[PDB]
Amino acid sequence: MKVIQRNCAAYLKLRNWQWWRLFTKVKPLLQVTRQEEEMQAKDEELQRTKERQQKAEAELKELEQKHTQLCEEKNLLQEKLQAETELYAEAEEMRVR
Amino acid sequence: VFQEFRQRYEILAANAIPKGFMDGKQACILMIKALELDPNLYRIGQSKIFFRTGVLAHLEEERDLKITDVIIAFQAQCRGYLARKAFAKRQQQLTAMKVIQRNCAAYLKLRNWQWWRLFTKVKPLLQVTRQEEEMQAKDEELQRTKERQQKAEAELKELEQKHTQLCEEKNLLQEKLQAETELYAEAEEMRVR
Amino acid sequence: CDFSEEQTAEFKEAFQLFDRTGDGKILYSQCGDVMRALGQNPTNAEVMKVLGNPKSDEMNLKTLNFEQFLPMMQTIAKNKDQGCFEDYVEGLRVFDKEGNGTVMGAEIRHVLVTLGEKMTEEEVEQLVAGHEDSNGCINYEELVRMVLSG
Amino acid sequence: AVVASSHKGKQGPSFSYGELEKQLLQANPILEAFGNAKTVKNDNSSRFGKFIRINFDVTGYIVGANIETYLLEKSRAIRQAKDERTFHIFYYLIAGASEQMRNDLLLEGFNNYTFLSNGHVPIPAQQDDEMFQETLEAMRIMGFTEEEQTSILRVVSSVLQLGNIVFKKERNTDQASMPDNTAAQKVCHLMGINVTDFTRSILTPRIKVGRDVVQKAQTKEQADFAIEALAKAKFERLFRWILTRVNKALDKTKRQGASFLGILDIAGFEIFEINSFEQLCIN
Numbered sequence: 001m002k003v004i005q006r007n008c009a010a011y012l013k014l015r016n017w018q019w020w021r022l023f024t025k026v027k028p029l030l031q032v033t034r035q036e037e038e039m040q041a042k043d044e045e046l047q048r049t050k051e052r053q054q055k056a057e058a059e060l061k062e063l064e065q066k067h068t069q070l071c072e073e074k075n076l077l078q079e080k081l082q083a084e085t086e087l088y089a090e091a092e093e094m095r096v097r
Numbered sequence: 098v099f100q101e102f103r104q105r106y107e108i109l110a111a112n113a114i115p116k117g118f119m120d121g122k123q124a125c126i127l128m129i130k131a132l133e134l135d136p137n138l139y140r141i142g143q144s145k146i147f148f149r150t151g152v153l154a155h156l157e158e159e160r161d162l163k164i165t166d167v168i169i170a171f172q173a174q175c176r177g178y179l180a181r182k183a184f185a186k187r188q189q190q191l192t193a194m195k196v197i198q199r200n201c202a203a204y205l206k207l208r209n210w211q212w213w214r215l216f217t218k219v220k221p222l223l224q225v226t227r228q229e230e231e232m233q234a235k236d237e238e239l240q241r242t243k244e245r246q247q248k249a250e251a252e253l254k255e256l257e258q259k260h261t262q263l264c265e266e267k268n269l270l271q272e273k274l275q276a277e278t279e280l281y282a283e284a285e286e287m288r289v290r
Numbered sequence: 291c292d293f294s295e296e297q298t299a300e301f302k303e304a305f306q307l308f309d310r311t312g313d314g315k316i317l318y319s320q321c322g323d324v325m326r327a328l329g330q331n332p333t334n335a336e337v338m339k340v341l342g343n344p345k346s347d348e349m350n351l352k353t354l355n356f357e358q359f360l361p362m363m364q365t366i367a368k369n370k371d372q373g374c375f376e377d378y379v380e381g382l383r384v385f386d387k388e389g390n391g392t393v394m395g396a397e398i399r400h401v402l403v404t405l406g407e408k409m410t411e412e413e414v415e416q417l418v419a420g421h422e423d424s425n426g427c428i429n430y431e432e433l434v435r436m437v438l439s440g
Numbered sequence: 441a442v443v444a445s446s447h448k449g450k451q452g453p454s455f456s457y458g459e460l461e462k463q464l465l466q467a468n469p470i471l472e473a474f475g476n477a478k479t480v481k482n483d484n485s486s487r488f489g490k491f492i493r494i495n496f497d498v499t500g501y502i503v504g505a506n507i508e509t510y511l512l513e514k515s516r517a518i519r520q521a522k523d524e525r526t527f528h529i530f531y532y533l534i535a536g537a538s539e540q541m542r543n544d545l546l547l548e549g550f551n552n553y554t555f556l557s558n559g560h561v562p563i564p565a566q567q568d569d570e571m572f573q574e575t576l577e578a579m580r581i582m583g584f585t586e587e588e589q590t591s592i593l594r595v596v597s598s599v600l601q602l603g604n605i606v607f608k609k610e611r612n613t614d615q616a617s618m619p620d621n622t623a624a625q626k627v628c629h630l631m632g633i634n635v636t637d638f639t640r641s642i643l644t645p646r647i648k649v650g651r652d653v654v655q656k657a658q659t660k661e662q663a664d665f666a667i668e669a670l671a672k673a674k675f676e677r678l679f680r681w682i683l684t685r686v687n688k689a690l691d692k693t694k695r696q697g698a699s700f701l702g703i704l705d706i707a708g709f710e711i712f713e714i715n716s717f718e719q720l721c722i723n
Contacts (some may be wrong), residue, residue, distance in 0.1 A: 056249035091284035177331030178440025
């Protein structure tokens with residue numbers, strides 16, 4: 001808090017000086033090269049996004065393998081069900097007879 | 098029946114029949130009066146109203162012709178809307194393009210003759226533009242990789258939805274199969290008995 | 291004439307905006323759709339009922355000066371007032387086989403292509419706000435408002 | 441709802457309780473409005489049995505809750521004995537609805553309904569309009585949308601109005617007829633179904649009996665029974681929806697828990713001029 005107060009008081013006293021407006025106009029033209037840091041950040045995030053892609057594609061493949069299995073099991077169970085329904089109908093009609 | 102008569106032909110007396118859940122029979126009477134039908138051409142029961150085939154048939158033809166007439170009016174209105182929309186678009190585009198091409202052509206002619214001729218000799222030394230190109234390329238590739246990620250996650254979600262669906266369908270079919278097998282057993286054993 | 295000096299001037303300025311081939315006029319085939327675009331919406335028949343020639347060598351060859359176009363536009367501006375929101379809503383209510391707003395695109399296509407004057411397979415695609423898959427389900431209430439504002 | 445609360449790290453009765461406690465304290469007035477009525481024994485008599493439970497973590501703080509509710513005395517609601525009332529929500533709606541709401545729901549004032557024997561029946565200490573406001577606001581606090589409020593109003597209006605579908609029997613055939621088809625038209629409109637089918641399925645239905653699908657002969661009494669049974673069905677479905685909706689508010693919480701504390705509240709011993717099965721199960 002003491003260092004905050006030192007900083008805030010110092011700025012508050014001085015910020016009414018006119019030159020600050022010229023400083024504020026000039027500084028963004030001169031200072032901080034920026035673009036190397038930006039490039040490095042983009043490259044770093046690209047690696048992370050590629051990692052997430054790899055994981056998403058792995059998860060996709062896992063889900064695909066389970067999907068086709070469940071689809072075949074569904075097909076087999078449906079075929080078998082239709083057979084048992086026909087057998088039930090045949091048994092029940094003859095039972096009535 | 099009176100409610101059927103009203104609901105089938107109300108268009109012919111929609112201005113005369115009052116709005117609300119009122120007695121259909123009164124609405125039918127109002128419509129029959131609006132048509133000014135001869136009282137020998139129909140007979141009013143408690144539920145069913147009897148009519149002459151040809152008279153009701155000819156009124157139906159007239160009513161359908163009137164529906165064609167308003168269809169033509171609506172066709173003209175929608176074609177009008179379409180024409181207006183097209184005109185509004187194309188004129189806006191024309192005025193925009195006229196100013197843009199005027200400006201771009203004017204500049205293009207001048208930058209091929211003025212101090213750009215000097216500037217272009219210095220330009221390849223300005224390393225800032227090269228670092229900007231690199232940055233832009235990295236951002237573009239990042240955006241592409243992010244797009245592929247989004248698509249991979251969408252595909253993943255689609256496969257997940259189908260996975261759980263197939264799992265539930267499998268469960269239901271298995272349960273149903275066991276039920277039908279039990280029913281078959283119960284039927285067949287009693288058949289033997 | 292019902293139009294003010296300002297309205298006549300506005301019509302002249304609008305007439306000047308069209309990318310015509312330097313004819314200084316407007317073609318009889320085109321003028322109907324100009325009048326539609328700029329104001330009131332006449333029918334295909336109305337363009338003849340305004341005492342324009344119902345038969346000619348060609349409607350693209352027949353052409354009119356602003357002095358002839360202005361009264362032709364004025365008469366429909368005064369005498370060709372279109373239906374109420376209530377009227378079009380009633381029409382669509384009687385048309386709608388689902389009786390709930392959600393009409394079928396195939397039926398809409400039928401009453402535009404088959405009935406009346408044949409609206410084209412290019413027009414219908416720019417008129418229909420929805421789509422025509424195996425369902426074809428679209429709400430007429432939006433369309434009626436769209437063309438009411440047109 | 442105060443002692444069992446976990447502390448968020450953020451004194452009086454206006455204290456800001458947790459989300460689940462806030463729902464719990466609104467569940468009571470919600471359920472009471474839909475489930476309580478006036479009887480000779482009690483002006484706020486519960487027509488239903490209930491059981492609340494609150495679930496705790498290993499630390500001893502609340503982490504979830506459940507509200508179970510048992511079969512209710514649903515029969516009385518359209519067969520009112522002298523000086524007895526229907527479910528409070530009906531009177532609260534009929535008194536509290538704005539002109540806009542009344543037109544939307546196709547409602548009228550009291551004594552305009554065949555299902556309302558004795559007509560309007562008073563109740564002390566309550567203020568029907570104010571109650572109508574606070575119960576709706578309680579539903580808003582329970583996280584209801586405006587649509588899922590008004591839809592309840594539509595169905596509860598429908599059971600109230602459908603009683604006005606009056607029948608008269610054709611002596612030549614003994615089949616029922618409907619001179620006041622306006623009532624049916626209003627009801628089927630509020631339900632969004634076809635008036636023609638709605639009229640004929642009540643008066644002379646065609647029912648599937650095994651292999652065949654056959655025209656059922658239908659008396660005045662059978663038609664009355666059919667529409668009253670339909671009212672019971674609508675009511676049971678709406679009450680079920682309410683009870684599930686209030687539990688699903690709590691069902692955001694996880695399935696883990698250490699132990700629980702229950703609260704049982706069954707309707708009391710009860711007797712009057714008629715004693716049918718509907719009272720016997722409770723007694």
